[PDB]
Inverse folding.
């Protein structure tokens, strides 16, 4: 019984570490994409204001 | 964006203040009145030219 629980713990832990590593990579790519688009928004906003 | 809006407003108000003496209805109205008083006076003087000449 102790050997079975340990095997379960190993599976869960493996899944967890694998997911966390791949999630951090997505979050970083996402934030970068948002900042790039936000910067484009900011340039357009300044040009519109000057024209007005 | 908010700074830009307020900055424009300020610029507009400043332009209006600087040109008010020649452009605002209030100041222009006062000048009209002074001119009408003198007109009337001159009309009167011209109407009594003979009497004034005799005097």
């Amino acid at each position: 019984m102790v050997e079975m629980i340990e095997s379960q713990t190993l599976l869960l832990t493996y899944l967890t570490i694998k997911m966390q590593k791949n999630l951090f990579r997505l979050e970083e790519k996402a934030e970068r994409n948002l900042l790039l688009v936000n910067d484009q928004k900011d340039q357009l906003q300044e040009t519109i204001h000057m024209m007005k | 964006a908010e700074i830009n809006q307020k900055s424009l407003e300020l610029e507009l108000l400043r332009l209006e203040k600087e040109t008010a003496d020649i452009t605002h209805p209030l100041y222009l109205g006062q000048k009209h009145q002074a001119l009408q008083a003198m007109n009337s006076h001159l009309e009167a003087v011209l109407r009594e030219k003979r009497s004034l000449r005799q005097r």
